Amino acid sequence: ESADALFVGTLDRLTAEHPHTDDPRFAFQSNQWNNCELRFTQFCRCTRELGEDDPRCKYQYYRAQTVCHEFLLEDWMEHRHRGTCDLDIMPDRQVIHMRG
Amino acid sequence: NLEDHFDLAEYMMKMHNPMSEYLYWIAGFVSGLHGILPLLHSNYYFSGMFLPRDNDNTQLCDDSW
Amino acid sequence: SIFTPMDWMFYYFPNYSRDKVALMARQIKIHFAIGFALVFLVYHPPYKGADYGNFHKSPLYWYKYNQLERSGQLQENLRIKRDWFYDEDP
Amino acid sequence: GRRLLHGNYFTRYLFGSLAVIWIAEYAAACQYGIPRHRNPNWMWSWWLEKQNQIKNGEIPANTPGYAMVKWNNEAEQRWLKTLNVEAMNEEFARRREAYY
Amino acid sequence: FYILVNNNKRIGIYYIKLSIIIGILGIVLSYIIRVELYNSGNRIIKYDNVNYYNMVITLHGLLMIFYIIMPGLYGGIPLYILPILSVITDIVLPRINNISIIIVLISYIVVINSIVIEYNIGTGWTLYPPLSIIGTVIVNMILYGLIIIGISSIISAINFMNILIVIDGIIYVYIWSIIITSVLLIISLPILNGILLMILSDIYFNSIYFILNGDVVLYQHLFWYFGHPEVYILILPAFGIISIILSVLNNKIIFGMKSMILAIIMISILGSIVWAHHIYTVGLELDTKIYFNNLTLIISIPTGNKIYNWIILYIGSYNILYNGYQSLIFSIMFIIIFIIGGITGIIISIDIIDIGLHDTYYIVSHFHYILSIGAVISLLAGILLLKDIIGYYNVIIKINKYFGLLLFININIIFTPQFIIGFNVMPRRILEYSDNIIVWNLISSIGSISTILILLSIF
Amino acid sequence: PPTRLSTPLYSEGGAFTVNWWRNRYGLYSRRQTDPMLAEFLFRQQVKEWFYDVPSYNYAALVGLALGILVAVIWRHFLFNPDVYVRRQELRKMWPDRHRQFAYAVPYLNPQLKNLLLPYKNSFIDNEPDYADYNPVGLRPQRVMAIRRIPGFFWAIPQYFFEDPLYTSCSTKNMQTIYKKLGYSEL
Amino acid sequence: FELNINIINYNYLGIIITVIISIYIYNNSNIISVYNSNLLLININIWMKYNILDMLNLNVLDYKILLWIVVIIISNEILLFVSFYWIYYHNYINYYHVNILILNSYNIVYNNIILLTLLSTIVNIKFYNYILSYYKYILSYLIYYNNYMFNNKIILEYKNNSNYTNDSVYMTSYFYIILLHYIHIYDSIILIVVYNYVNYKNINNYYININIYYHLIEVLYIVISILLYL
Amino acid sequence: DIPWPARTDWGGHDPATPFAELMINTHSMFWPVAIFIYVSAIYMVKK
Amino acid sequence: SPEDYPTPQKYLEGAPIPSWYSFQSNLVGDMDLKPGMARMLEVDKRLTVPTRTHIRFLITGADVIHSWSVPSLGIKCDATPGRLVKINTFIQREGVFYGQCSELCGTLHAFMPIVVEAVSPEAFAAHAKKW
Ligand SMILES: CCCCCCCCCCCCCCCCCC(=O)OC[C@H](COP(=O)([O-])OCC(O)COP(=O)([O-])OC[C@@H](COC(=O)CCCCCCCCCCCCCCCCC)OC(=O)CCCCCCCCCCCCCCCCC)OC(=O)CCCCCCCCCCCCCCCCC
Ligand code: HEA
Ligand code: HEA
Ligand SMILES: CCCCCCCC/C=C/CCCCCCCC(=O)OC[C@H](COP(=O)(O)OCCN)OC(=O)CCCCCCC/C=C/CCCCCCCC
Ligand code: CUA
Ligand SMILES: [O-][O-]
Ligand SMILES: [Cu+2]
Numbered sequence A: 001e002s003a004d005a006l007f008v009g010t011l012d013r014l015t016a017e018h019p020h021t022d023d024p025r026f027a028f029q030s031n032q033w034n035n036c037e038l039r040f041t042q043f044c045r046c047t048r049e050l051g052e053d054d055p056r057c058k059y060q061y062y063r064a065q066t067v068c069h070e071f072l073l074e075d076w077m078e079h080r081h082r083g084t085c086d087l088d089i090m091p092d093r094q095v096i097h098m099r100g
Numbered sequence B: 001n002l003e004d005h006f007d008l009a010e011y012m013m014k015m016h017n018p019m020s021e022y023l024y025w026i027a028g029f030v031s032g033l034h035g036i037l038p039l040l041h042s043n044y045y046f047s048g049m050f051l052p053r054d055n056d057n058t059q060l061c062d063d064s065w
Numbered sequence C: 001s002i003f004t005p006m007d008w009m010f011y012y013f014p015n016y017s018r019d020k021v022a023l024m025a026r027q028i029k030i031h032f033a034i035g036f037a038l039v040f041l042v043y044h045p046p047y048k049g050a051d052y053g054n055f056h057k058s059p060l061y062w063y064k065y066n067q068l069e070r071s072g073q074l075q076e077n078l079r080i081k082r083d084w085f086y087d088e089d090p
Numbered sequence D: 001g002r003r004l005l006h007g008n009y010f011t012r013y014l015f016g017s018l019a020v021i022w023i024a025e026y027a028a029a030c031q032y033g034i035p036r037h038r039n040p041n042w043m044w045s046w047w048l049e050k051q052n053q054i055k056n057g058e059i060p061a062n063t064p065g066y067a068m069v070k071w072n073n074e075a076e077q078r079w080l081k082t083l084n085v086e087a088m089n090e091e092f093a094r095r096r097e098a099y100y
Numbered sequence E: 001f002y003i004l005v006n007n008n009k010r011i012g013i014y015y016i017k018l019s020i021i022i023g024i025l026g027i028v029l030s031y032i033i034r035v036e037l038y039n040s041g042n043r044i045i046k047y048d049n050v051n052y053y054n055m056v057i058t059l060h061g062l063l064m065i066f067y068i069i070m071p072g073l074y075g076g077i078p079l080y081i082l083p084i085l086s087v088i089t090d091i092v093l094p095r096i097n098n099i100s101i102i103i104v105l106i107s108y109i110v111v112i113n114s115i116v117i118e119y120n121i122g123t124g125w126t127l128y129p130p131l132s133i134i135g136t137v138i139v140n141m142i143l144y145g146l147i148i149i150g151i152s153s154i155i156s157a158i159n160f161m162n163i164l165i166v167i168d169g170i171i172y173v174y175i176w177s178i179i180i181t182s183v184l185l186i187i188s189l190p191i192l193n194g195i196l197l198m199i200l201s202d203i204y205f206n207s208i209y210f211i212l213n214g215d216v217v218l219y220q221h222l223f224w225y226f227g228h229p230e231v232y233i234l235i236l237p238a239f240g241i242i243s244i245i246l247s248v249l250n251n252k253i254i255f256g257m258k259s260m261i262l263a264i265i266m267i268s269i270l271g272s273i274v275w276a277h278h279i280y281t282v283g284l285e286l287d288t289k290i291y292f293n294n295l296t297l298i299i300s301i302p303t304g305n306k307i308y309n310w311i312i313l314y315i316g317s318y319n320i321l322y323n324g325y326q327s328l329i330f331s332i333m334f335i336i337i338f339i340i341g342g343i344t345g346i347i348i349s350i351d352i353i354d355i356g357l358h359d360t361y362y363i364v365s366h367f368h369y370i371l372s373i374g375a376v377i378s379l380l381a382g383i384l385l386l387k388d389i390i391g392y393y394n395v396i397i398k399i400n401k402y403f404g405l406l407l408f409i410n411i412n413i414i415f416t417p418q419f420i421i422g423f424n425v426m427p428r429r430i431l432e433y434s435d436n437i438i439v440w441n442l443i444s445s446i447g448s449i450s451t452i453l454i455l456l457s458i459f
Numbered sequence F: 001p002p003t004r005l006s007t008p009l010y011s012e013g014g015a016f017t018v019n020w021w022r023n024r025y026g027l028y029s030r031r032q033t034d035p036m037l038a039e040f041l042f043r044q045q046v047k048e049w050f051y052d053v054p055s056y057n058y059a060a061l062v063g064l065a066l067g068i069l070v071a072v073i074w075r076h077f078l079f080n081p082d083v084y085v086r087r088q089e090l091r092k093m094w095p096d097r098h099r100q101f102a103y104a105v106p107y108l109n110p111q112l113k114n115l116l117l118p119y120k121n122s123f124i125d126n127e128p129d130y131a132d133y134n135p136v137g138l139r140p141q142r143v144m145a146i147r148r149i150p151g152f153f154w155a156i157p158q159y160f161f162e163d164p165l166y167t168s169c170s171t172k173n174m175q176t177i178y179k180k181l182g183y184s185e186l
Numbered sequence G: 001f002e003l004n005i006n007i008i009n010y011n012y013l014g015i016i017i018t019v020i021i022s023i024y025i026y027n028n029s030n031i032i033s034v035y036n037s038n039l040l041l042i043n044i045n046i047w048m049k050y051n052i053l054d055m056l057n058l059n060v061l062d063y064k065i066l067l068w069i070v071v072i073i074i075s076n077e078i079l080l081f082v083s084f085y086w087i088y089y090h091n092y093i094n095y096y097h098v099n100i101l102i103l104n105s106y107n108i109v110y111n112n113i114i115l116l117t118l119l120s121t122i123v124n125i126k127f128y129n130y131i132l133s134y135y136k137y138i139l140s141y142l143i144y145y146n147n148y149m150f151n152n153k154i155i156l157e158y159k160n161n162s163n164y165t166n167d168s169v170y171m172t173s174y175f176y177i178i179l180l181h182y183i184h185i186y187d188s189i190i191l192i193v194v195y196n197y198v199n200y201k202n203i204n205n206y207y208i209n210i211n212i213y214y215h216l217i218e219v220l221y222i223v224i225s226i227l228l229y230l
Numbered sequence H: 001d002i003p004w005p006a007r008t009d010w011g012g013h014d015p016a017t018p019f020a021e022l023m024i025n026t027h028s029m030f031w032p033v034a035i036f037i038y039v040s041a042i043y044m045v046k047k
Numbered sequence I: 001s002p003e004d005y006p007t008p009q010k011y012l013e014g015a016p017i018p019s020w021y022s023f024q025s026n027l028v029g030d031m032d033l034k035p036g037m038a039r040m041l042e043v044d045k046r047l048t049v050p051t052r053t054h055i056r057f058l059i060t061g062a063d064v065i066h067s068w069s070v071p072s073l074g075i076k077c078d079a080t081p082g083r084l085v086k087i088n089t090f091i092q093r094e095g096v097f098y099g100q101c102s103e104l105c106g107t108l109h110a111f112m113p114i115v116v117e118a119v120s121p122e123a124f125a126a127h128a129k130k131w
């Protein structure tokens, strides 16, 4: 309700209420690749917590589509289904802190 | 020697054999052919003709020739 | 010295210009600091320069504004000339 | 014997440049109000909660992260078929007894 | 001997001779392009052989830049007069000078052989990936030519820099022009080599720099970090020539010699930091765009000072001296023509104007007016000034007002209409186009055939 | 500029002076083989390059250009949200990079952007305020300028109150016209 | 009175070297390329002999000319490495969160930095002896041992690395930067194998060139170590 | 919208967005300065 | 938590989440041209957009660098692989705006035109509902 409610809670909310507008974290740059990757990671984390059938995660996918072209999503969604998507590996099976 | 004073003395003193000039022009002519001959060869390879007929890739009137 | 003919600098400030090598160095340094300052003091400053209620209105602005205000031109200029798309066909 | 550069030029411009870089960065952080406290962890809240449950003993030790999600990819389904946390814990317990 | 000669003056002649030979191939390609563009339809290239057109435009650009104008203005006139201007017996590195010209010829043979033997495809002279790295072997051959050419350019740059150690007189403006171009080469070439090696790695070593998660825009940065310094490496020697001709023919001492020299130095430094005006439409950050646009407009200041210093050289000269000599006419024509090219450069420098005018024939006309007209005429004017010293004959050029007039008129008929179609708009690097752009394309084509005919009258 | 070697040249103290330049000018020189000849050549160079009035104009231009250049480089590294030198945030997924997201909004609103955006009405004839209103709040609401941009904008009147058609071309009157037809919301 | 310069009028090595280069392109066998490289080495050595024989001219400016050429070359070597560092940092935003194992910061960096430092100390001793008109036989063989160990360590690292060039631009840049350094290390072997005592001493450009080059390569490794390992 | 025959269209033509109008006017704004730079310099190309 | 994934209340109550539709736009061949079609510029599927609306165009290139150019809309954005460039537009008049690829992209760089037709918002809604 509050006028600044969107900024309150998360920076994510801003684009969730206005899907086709600039995200505060990426509005400074015309290139929106990083924006797409954040949105996909957020869809991946939603399903892990709520499942695919949850309306929330379905909307997190619509939000990802708003910024990600279909040819990228289809490829990244196949990697996710196989279990090779680097944005969805469970954190205890990551290797980012190993050997350096 | 007096003959060796000037670089390219025969040419500068206007005694050189004309064949040297002919070779230079021939070399330039061959260089030019490297743009035309492969054009003809490539056209025939992918079409069967050495050169197209103007606007033969578009619809033409019945009497067009 | 900014936008300064250095012939004038040599004439009016002879002692400051005596060492021409040092004079050249100051020329470079002064303009280097000016360029650096412009980026970080005119362009960079965040969340500044958005006070559009404080648009500077120069003495010439008011001269021309009052002239038109005195006559009806200012009212006529500000009036909306058309607020419909189609004319009515008789 | 005539000198071209500063008598201590190498150390001067090396350490000096590093000092200016560090000081300028602190100034930049202050002007933008950037949080300066280093966090070495991921911020996925649900994950950090699961990790606390493991530290509290609510979730058994060495339980994989894919044994806790509400959606599993194909490769994690393959792993779940061979997962035996109870056996893993017993094996670790045996090792400790042998060591001591 | 012929190939073994180390004489710096003989090698200078070789550079001019080879530039004319390779130039014949360059002009022929240009005629193919303009013939094709005469109307809409296919005229001399089949629709199934459109890859040949892409190769024609690619080779045209590469040959004219690296194998014709650069060997002519930085290898030809420089190797012949620089050691004389420096009152030194000969060039500092005799054996290196010999191998440089041989290297240029060998790289030319590789390129033309690749036309004949390899499949003919093109990716522009700017070899943008990923298109350049998904092509056939002809791209590999072209890369070898560029790398080999780079070796010759750098060693020649080293040769000229050594003149500072031996010069026995005063460093004239022309000598300063070559030295600064040499510096620009020493600093820009090593970066080019690196990015070219990365193109090779992706073509031949299964590297992945130019596939997803690797930024293709990276290539454009490193390429143009050499690209724009290249356009000034090609123009600065021309400026040096213009200064000598105007002073000598008008019998007037150069005015503002130190400002001329400091203008050349300034152009080089600025030209080394403005490359991204070629990358305006990629989507760079707002502040980057503003920086590059700002610094690009600054280059006009030093460039403008040189132009006005040239004008006063011609002003006030004695009337009794005959002013119809071809060298003098060409030198004057350069000022008139270069201003047109530079002003249009400033127009395209504004990025918002550039959005409309990027990859359009306006850009073509811009760099043609400077290179195809300005640089060519400067090289001609320089050779013409040295006709007695060089000693060539069997041509009617020295006093030929018809040639100068016809060349000026017809060259403008070719490229002035290309400015118009830039707001029509006709993209670059295309062969087919809409029927409503035929008029201007036709006019330019008539100009191209005419210019070629005028090249035959000199003999 | 003295013409006799007996008359000394004045030098300031510091790292760029006549004395500092003399010490280093002939380090690589084969021509300065004795004091008399060395001084003659040194003064010849100083006279030619440092006593040349127009040369100082280029000194100003190099300083200005270099100062801008150094600062734009530094600004990117220090403030641009997309330039990473530290690695903490690069070792985390995008949703977790809070410290780097803090640079975003401050960097999105530089002073000159706020100062110059109102002057779009000097480049656009129809609806120059088409993009002024934005309900989100990432950027300030924009108000059109009252005067033309100083310089080469002679085609527009010096002040927009002088222009007769300015008010009728606003996005507000255009919205009124189209809303009266039911054509569009904006 | 004599001329200031003894002009060289003719040269035929240039043709041979340029033809040798073409063979690299116009060939159907990689064995031909191996033997062609030997031809290149031979003819480049002849050019070096021409430089040594130019000593007979007793020209003071010859040392200076060659020295400044080396300066330019070193500059070109530094700028090529810069281009690789540029390629590396341009994609920095895609590093450290990918499922690859980056290199440790303990083992490789330390033993390599310690090793390359010892190489510098040997070259420094060679310079000191050069100044003192003295020679120590064992010095060159210490360099050979250092090069052998460096080659032994780099070979094992590459063979035992579990990430490949096609895995990420990070891995490609790591391998390429390390290879570029190695190539410059191998070029140092090419130069140092001929080190001997020459009685014309400090008018020999070889000695100053070796000192500069070795320092460049070691300094370049400090930059690499900070970028990649630390 | 579409190119038309024998049209100069100096600076652009038929804008359909506010930004398109901006581009045309930016070119038109600088064009007189370009003419001044050319005319003023060329007039002095003479003996 | 569920609230770490912000979603509008309407969708949480069962409202249908929108889908997306993709279509391919290809040049009309010379032999397929009709009497009135513009050669080198016509396409078989045009992009319809509403006028007097703020539209965000996100442009990328799948394989090589293309460039999406619509001169009438003042848009020339490079379709570079790896970069999803945002371009904002506000069409003011109806019509059909023709453009061409502006980055040499291979053999048929000259044969992938860009046709955008701007219609009234009421017309766009009807079109989108049917197609
Ligand atoms: C841009 C254009 C327009 C420009 C306009 C503006 C110009 C402004 C002015 C510019 C001036 C620049 C400075 C000039 C300085 C000149 C100095 C000079 O003269 O130096 C002396 C120099 C040498 O004189 P010299 O000192 O007496 O030398 C004595 C020799 O060393 C010793 O004498 P020798 O007799 O013993 O010589 C040996 C001779 C021995 O020669 C012979 O025995 C010759 C026998 C006859 C052979 C004739 C050719 C046969 C060809 C057959 C083809 C058959 C095709 C069949 C096809 C069938 C198809 C079905 O040769 C050889 O053995 C080797 C020859 C190698 C070179 C020739 C190569 C030809 C091309 C080869 C292509 C191969 C492609 C292979 C592809 C393979 C793919 C798998 O002069 C020259 O070399 C000639 C220069 C002439 C021009 C000078 C400039 C004049 C002004 C410009 C005019 C315009 C030119 C335009 C360009 C050309 C257009 C085409
Ligand atoms: C030697 C050749 C040469 C020269 C000198 C220049 C000079 C300049 N060029 Fe260049 N340019 C090219 C060759 C050259 N260019 C080529 C070949 C390309 C295309 C490459 C490709 O894309 O494939 C290109 C492309 C190119 C573009 C790309 C446009 C696009 O990609 O869409 C731009 C825009 O910034 C540009 C700008 C400039 C500027 C601002 C100058 C300045 O140097 C001009 C300076 C001169 C003047 C300004 C006139 C003289 C000065 C005065 C009369 C003083 C008074 C004037 C003022 C105060 C303004 N050039
Ligand atoms: C300096 C280099 C140079 C020169 C001289 C020319 C000269 C000419 N160019 Fe140029 N051209 C380029 C460099 C050059 N060009 C480049 C770099 C491109 C872009 C490549 C790309 O798109 O990828 C290009 C593109 C280009 C195209 C675009 C094709 C396309 O991509 O769609 C066209 C045709 O419209 C064209 C036409 C011409 C014509 C008609 C001439 C001339 O024929 C005009 C007439 C003038 C002469 C015939 C005299 C020339 C004489 C000499 C060069 C020899 C001089 C030697 C001495 C004086 C010793 N050029
Ligand atoms: C010799 C003793 C041992 C020294 C050991 C040093 C080891 C580490 C060295 C690393 C490289 C040098 C830089 C060190 C920086 C340390 C501070 C630091 O982390 O800085 C981070 C900061 C930004 O960090 P983030 O928070 O991730 O980004 C936020 C959004 N932008 O980056 C920097 O400031 C460092 C990078 C830039 C360094 C150079 C300064 C920038 C300007 C360069 C100008 C170049 C043009 C010419 C200048 C000429 C002189 C005026
Ligand atoms: Cu696609 Cu051009
Ligand atoms: O390129 O200017
Ligand atoms: Cu450029």
Ligand SMILES: [K+]
Residues within 6 Å of the ligand: E036, E037, E038, E039, E040, E041, E042, E043, E431, E432, E433
């Ligand atoms: K055509």
Ligand SMILES: [Mg+2]
Residues within 6 Å of the ligand: E358, E359, I102, I103
């Ligand atoms: Mg482009």
